[PDB]
Amino acid sequence: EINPSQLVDTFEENWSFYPNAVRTAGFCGNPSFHLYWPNKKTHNALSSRELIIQPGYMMQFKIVVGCEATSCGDLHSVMLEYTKDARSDSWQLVQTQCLPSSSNSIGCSPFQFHEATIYNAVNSSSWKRITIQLPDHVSSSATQFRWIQKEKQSWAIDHVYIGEACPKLCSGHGYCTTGAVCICDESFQGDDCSVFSHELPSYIKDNFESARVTEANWETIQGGVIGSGCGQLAPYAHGDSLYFNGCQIRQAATKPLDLTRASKIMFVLQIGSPAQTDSCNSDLSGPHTVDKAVLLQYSVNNGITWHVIAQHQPKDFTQAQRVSYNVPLEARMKGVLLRWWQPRHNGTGHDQWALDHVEVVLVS
Ligand SMILES: *[C@@H]1O[C@H](CO)[C@@H](O[C@@H]2O[C@H](CO)[C@@H](O[C@@H]3O[C@H](CO[C@H]4O[C@H](CO)[C@@H](O)[C@H](O[C@H]5O[C@H](CO)[C@@H](O)[C@H](O)[C@@H]5O)[C@@H]4O)[C@@H](O)[C@H](O[C@H]4O[C@H](CO)[C@@H](O)[C@H](O)[C@@H]4O)[C@@H]3O)[C@H](O)[C@H]2NC(C)=O)[C@H](O)[C@H]1NC(C)=O
Numbered sequence: 001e002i003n004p005s006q007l008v009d010t011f012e013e014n015w016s017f018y019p020n021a022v023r024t025a026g027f028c029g030n031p032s033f034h035l036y037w038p039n040k041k042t043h044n045a046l047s048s049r050e051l052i053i054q055p056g057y058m059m060q061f062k063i064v065v066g067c068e069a070t071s072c073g074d075l076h077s078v079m080l081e082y083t084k085d086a087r088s089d090s091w092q093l094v095q096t097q098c099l100p101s102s103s104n105s106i107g108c109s110p111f112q113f114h115e116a117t118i119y120n121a122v123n124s125s126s127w128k129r130i131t132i133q134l135p136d137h138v139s140s141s142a143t144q145f146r147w148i149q150k151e152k153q154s155w156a157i158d159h160v161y162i163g164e165a166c167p168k169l170c171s172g173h174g175y176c177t178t179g180a181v182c183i184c185d186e187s188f189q190g191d192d193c194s195v196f197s198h199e200l201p202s203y204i205k206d207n208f209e210s211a212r213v214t215e216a217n218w219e220t221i222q223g224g225v226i227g228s229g230c231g232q233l234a235p236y237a238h239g240d241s242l243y244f245n246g247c248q249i250r251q252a253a254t255k256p257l258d259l260t261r262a263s264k265i266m267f268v269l270q271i272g273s274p275a276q277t278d279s280c281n282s283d284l285s286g287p288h289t290v291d292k293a294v295l296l297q298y299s300v301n302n303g304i305t306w307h308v309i310a311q312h313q314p315k316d317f318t319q320a321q322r323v324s325y326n327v328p329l330e331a332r333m334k335g336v337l338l339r340w341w342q343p344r345h346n347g348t349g350h351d352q353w354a355l356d357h358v359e360v361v362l363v364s
């Protein structure tokens with residue numbers, strides 16, 4: 001007598017309206033059946049049925065926006081929204097931006113900084129799997145979600161799951177299926193898919209003096225290259241730094257590490273320059289200075305949630321400094337990710353930063 005409480009579709013009555021959508025396969029590296037919107041007179045979108053949803057539900061899907069495109073273009077954002085009565089066209093984003101500058105609103109928790117649920121060619125140029133512990137304001141007796149792109153960019157969706165949160169959201173190494181059970185990815189096991197079958201590195205060392213060691217050490221490096229834009233990083237460091245001048249997302253996130261024996265995280269950081277050069281500058285007058293800080297974060301779920309170890313405001317790092325932090329107990333586990341990230345910035349030529357002497361002591 002009530003609407004369904006789950007929706008699983010790897011690709012009939014699950015989906016309400018899907019303008020311009022086409023059910024195909026083999027787009028941009030996905031061999032499975034998925035639905036695609038081509039680049040080819042309406043807002044193309046994909047909506048769902050009305051769903052009863054309760055606090056503690058999750059949403060997980062696979063998405064592409066612009067296959068193999070250069071990121072610096074704003075292009076056409078795919079927004080993931082929710083609604084509670086379709087008759088009134090009251091649609092709101094599933095997750096809103098939660099930055100250090102923003103107040104703690106409905107979506108935003110104190111220090112759990114995340115992004116919004118809009119997806120662009122910058123982010124999903126490759127098939128990415130997004131997992132969200134959806135906020136409690138989404139829950140209702142008949143909630144509908146939709147992906148809308150309000151001359152267009154292609155985009156695609158596959159393996160959608162909306163329903164009860166299964167243990168630990170499958171730990172970011174597995175997918176949730178019918179009945180709130182977790183089917184793990186390759187080489188991961190357990191009821192929550194947290195246990196890695198193989199072993200992981202004990203500690204990471206990187207002075208960025210050889211491109212091969214850095215290519216082995218890091219999983220994602222976005223918006224920055226091995227260079228010397230802010231100069232030789234410090235009195236504390238030398239040579240080529242990881243220097244972030246690139247447009248859009250500026251990020252350096254390690255491969256999975258084993259931090260059970262990790263003691264402290266040390267590095268040398270600079271944000272801007274005393275010279276305030278075009279290669280390396282910082283806006284200390286703007287009110288959004290907190291968003292232009294370099295956040296050090298850790299993740300135990302392979303990227304679903306990041307927790308702050310330290311924040312580095314640009315006012316305190318005009319001259320590069322060496323810093324050391326204790327690895328929190330919650331982060332002293334197997335399969336931990338470390339990340340250096342700039343939340344906001346003004347594109348190339350603005351708000352640059354450099355990183356060097358990445359050292360995990362991991363020793364008595
Ligand atoms: C980096 O990137 C950011 C974003 O693009 C730049 O920030 C922009 O700076 C310019 C100034 O160079 C701002 O223009 C001014 O806007 C005010 C009115 O602002 C009000 O209304 C805006 C929408 O209409 C709104 O965005 C504003 O809110 C911003 O600022 C408040 C705090 O002030 C903050 O709470 C918000 O979150 C936003 O950050 C605000 O509500 C206007 O009065 C100004 O006009 C004067 O100056 C111009 C010439 O400069 C002149 O022609 C006018 O007659 C008048 O004298 C001016 O237009 C712009 O709003 C900013 N945008 C954002 C999104 O913040 C930043 O400058 C870039 N560079 C650097 C180095 O940081």
Ligand SMILES: *[C@@H]1O[C@H](CO)[C@@H](O[C@@H]2O[C@H](CO)[C@@H](O[C@@H]3O[C@H](CO[C@H]4O[C@H](CO)[C@@H](O)[C@H](O)[C@@H]4O)[C@@H](O)[C@H](O)[C@@H]3O)[C@H](O)[C@H]2NC(C)=O)[C@H](O)[C@H]1NC(C)=O
Nearest residue numbers: 074077096097098102114115116117118119120122123248
């Ligand atoms: C990559 O993925 C990101 C998320 O994973 C995508 O992020 C979103 O990108 C769009 C731009 O394409 C941004 O949209 C703008 O955001 C501002 C902020 O809204 C403010 O409004 C109220 C005013 O009352 C204020 O209180 C809020 O705190 C906000 O500050 C909007 O006003 C604009 O209309 C516009 O929507 C998103 O902000 C941004 N999300 C995040 C988390 O930053 C992103 O698009 C993808 N691609 C790229 C290139 O980054």
Ligand SMILES: [Ca+2]
Nearest residue numbers: 010032033159
């Ligand atoms: Ca599929």
Ligand SMILES: [Ca+2]
Nearest residue numbers: 207238239240
């Ligand atoms: Ca170096």
